[PDB]
C-alpha cells in the first residue's frame, strides 16, 4: 500500500474521522460537499504544509477545543525492503535510510532487529500536524528532511 490511514480531529466539518483500508480504486459518493470538499481541503492543506508552503490554517469544527490534528500514516514497508538490502549502495537509498528508518532502528537490540527482519513485518511512519488556537502549527517530527522526503 501507500497510505495506511488519515485521521482528522476537530477541523472544518470533521469531529473525529479516520479513513483506512485504502484500496487501489477509491470511489467517493454521497450528498454534495457534506465533507467531500472538506476532506479534499484537509488533504491539500496537509500536503501544502508538508512542503513548507505558507497556506492559511483550517477552521475549527468547535471552538471548545484548543487544537485540530491531521495524522497521516505512511506505509514504508517496501521502501525499507528497498534500502535495507546490501546491493543498493546508492546515495539516495543511503539518505532514505539515514532519514526515515534511522532513530527507530538504533534503539532496537539485536534480537528485535532480527525478529523484525525475518518476520513478514509491515513498517509504518506516522506524522501528525497540529493546529493550535493561535494559528501555530506543530509537527510530531521536527526534522524538515523527513517531511520533504515523505
Amino acid at each position: 500500500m501507500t497510505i495506511e490511514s488519515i485521521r482528522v480531529k476537530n477541523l472544518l466539518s470533521f469531529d473525529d474521522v479516520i479513513l483506512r483500508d485504502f484500496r487501489d480504486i477509491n470511489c467517493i459518493i454521497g450528498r454534495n460537499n457534506v465533507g467531500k470538499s472538506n476532506l479534499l481541503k484537509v488533504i491539500r492543506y496537509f500536503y501544502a504544509k508538508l512542503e513548507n508552503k505558507k497556506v492559511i490554517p483550517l477552521d475549527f469544527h468547535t471552538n471548545y477545543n484548543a487544537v485540530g490534528e491531521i495524522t497521516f500514516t505512511f506505509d514504508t514497508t517496501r521502501i525499507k525492503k528497498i534500502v535495507t538490502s546490501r546491493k543498493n549502495n546508492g546515495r539516495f537509498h543511503k539518505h532514505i535510510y539515514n532519514t526515515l528508518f534511522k532513530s527507530s532502528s538504533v534503539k532496537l537490540n539485536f534480537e528485535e532487529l532480527i525478529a523484525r527482519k525475518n518476520s513478514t513485518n509491515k513498517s509504518f511512519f506516522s506524522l501528525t500536524l497540529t493546529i493550535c488556537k493561535d494559528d501555530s502549527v506543530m509537527w510530531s517530527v521536527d526534522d524538515p528532511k523527513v517531511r520533504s522526503l515523505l
Binding site: F74, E112, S126, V141
Partner: peptide
C-alpha cells in the same frame, strides 16, 4: 513505544 521518529 520503543521507537523514535514516526513510531506507533
Amino acid at each position: 513505544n520503543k521507537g523514535g521518529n514516526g513510531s506507533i
